[PDB]
Write a protein that binds this ligand. Structure first.
Ligand SMILES: O=c1ccn([C@@H]2O[C@H](COP(=O)(O)OP(=O)(O)O[C@H]3O[C@H](CO)[C@H](O)[C@H](O)[C@H]3O)[C@@H](O)[C@H]2O)c(=O)[nH]1
Ligand SMILES: OC[C@H]1O[C@@H](O[C@H]2[C@H](O)[C@@H](O)[C@H](O)O[C@@H]2CO)[C@H](O)[C@@H](O)[C@H]1O
Ligand SMILES: [Co+2]
Length: 278
């Protein structure tokens, strides 16, 4: 059916990494033919899902900007369902959605520690994949709420398993990655090992793969807590361990999740999504 040559040309971005040793593309602005993919996926009649959690003061503020920008830039041309997880549903703001967009809201019990809020996402996402999302969408993205779409974030990002390159580390040496380095943690990665440092603010894939991502991360979170240890960067450490062992079939460049606090080097041609201030 579809082959990499049909839509992806790595040679259009020669100054950056565009392919991995396991044959996965790194999608940079200029390398992809979105028109070919729009037509390809429209034939298939796909629906894309997007989960976001919002707890505490995050609820009304970031969520409005996130959803407003998402409705504007996320997978335009194809049906989308927004899955919104909140602790108090009263905080859910009213965002008018465009054609073929809808949403569902669920009330979640907020955890005590800010670290468990972020990590408990993994369990909750898996539960809703089994309960309904596996029957509602063909691809699924899970995103932090404290970020904002800036340009088209389209079907060029879809794949079996999708990882995001952390903007601060994509040109760094693996020995400088902030992996979990304690052998006692399930997320342990030795020095000299690792392909990239992936950002936990964006990951996706088919519901099947996302279930495995979130189930395996959650089990590592669980094993760690039972040994009274918490990974350096919590779920992100476990996600990086997971993608080390289970290579993503597609990687998104830092253009798809950029921190302007870095600046704007020549590598970043067109930002599709940017961090919010932390
Ligand atoms: O009080 C809270 C805490 C967390 N969150 C949710 O958890 C996400 C992660 O928290 P932050 O965005 O505040 O922190 P970071 O930018 O440091 O998050 C990054 O590091 C985390 C681990 O520390 C996770 O790996 C996360 O996926 C990754 O984007 C938020 O986007 C939000 O969706 C809330 O809604 N409210
Ligand atoms: O290292 C993972 C961690 O990165 C944070 O980003 C830091 C970055 O690591 C640091 O080099 C730079 O000086 O400041 C950035 C902003 O604090 C992310 O904020 C965090 O979520 C993790 O992804
Ligand atoms: Co964040």
């Amino acid at each position: 059916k579809l082959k990499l040559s049909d839509w992806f040309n790595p040679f259009k971005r020669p100054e950056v990494v565009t392919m991995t040793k396991w044959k996965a593309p790194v999608v940079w602005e200029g390398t992809y033919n979105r028109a070919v993919l729009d037509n390809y996926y429209a034939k298939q009649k796909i629906t894309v899902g997007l989960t976001v959690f919002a707890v505490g003061r995050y609820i009304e503020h970031y969520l409005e900007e996130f959803l407003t920008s998402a409705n504007k830039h996320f997978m335009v041309g194809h049906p989308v369902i927004f899955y919104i997880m909140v602790d108090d549903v009263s905080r859910m703001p009213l965002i008018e959605l465009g054609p073929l967009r809808s949403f569902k809201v669920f009330k979640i019990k907020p955890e005590k520690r800010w670290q468990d809020i972020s990590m408990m996402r993994m369990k909750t996402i898996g539960e809703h994949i089994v309960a309904h999302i596996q029957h509602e969408v063909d691809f699924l993205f899970c995103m932090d709420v404290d970020q904002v779409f800036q340009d088209k974030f389209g079907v060029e990002t879809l794949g079996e398993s999708v990882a995001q390159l952390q903007a601060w580390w994509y040109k760094a040496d693996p020995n400088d990655f902030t992996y979990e380095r304690r052998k006692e943690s399930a997320a342990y990665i030795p020095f000299g090992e690792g392909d990239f440092y992936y950002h936990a603010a964006i990951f996706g894939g088919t519901p099947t793969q996302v279930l495995n991502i979130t189930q395996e991360c959650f089990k590592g979170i669980l094993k760690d807590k039972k040994n009274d240890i918490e990974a350096q960067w919590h779920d992100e450490s476990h996600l990086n361990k997971y993608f080390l062992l289970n290579k993503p079939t597609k990687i998104l460049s830092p253009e798809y999740c950029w921190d302007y606090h870095i600046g704007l080097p020549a590598d970043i041609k067109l930002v599709k999504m940017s961090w919010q201030t932390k």
